[PDB]
């Protein structure tokens, strides 16, 4: 039956789709991590500016 041939095409395509999909999942996760680290650093800046402002006051 032709399935023994055709499945070799579909195997390469499925392996390709998995590798690209895993990189897309990592891209989405890295975008979320960038937001989360930015949210921490802006609070550290607010706290530093607060200490400077209290010293100037």
């Amino acid at each position: 039956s032709q399935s023994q041939g055709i499945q070799q095409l579909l195997q390469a395509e499925k392996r390709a789709a998995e590798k690209v999909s895993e990189a897309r999942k990592r891209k989405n996760r890295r975008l979320k991590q960038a937001k989360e680290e930015a949210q921490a650093e802006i609070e550290q800046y607010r706290l530093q500016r607060e200490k400077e402002f209290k010293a100037k006051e």
Binding site: Q8, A12, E13, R15, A16, A17, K19, V20, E22, A23, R24, R26, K27, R30, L31, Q33, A34, K35, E37, A38, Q39, E41, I42, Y45, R46, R49, E50, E52, F53
Partner: protein
């Protein structure tokens, strides 16, 4: 004939997997760029707004 065709495809089909891995590695490089771009834009914009308040 048929055995040489099966050997030729079994070798050549690896180039599709290699190009798919190279595309995934380009998406991973775009992920590292976008992480730095998004983090930098958010940190600087908010830091400037916070600084102006003080």
């Amino acid at each position: 004939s048929d055995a040489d065709v099966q050997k030729q495809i079994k070798h050549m089909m690896a180039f599709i997997e290699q190009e798919a891995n190279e595309k995934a590695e380009e998406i991973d490089a775009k992920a590292e760029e976008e992480f730095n771009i998004e983090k930098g834009r958010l940190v600087q914009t908010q830091r400037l707004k916070i600084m102006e308040y003080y």
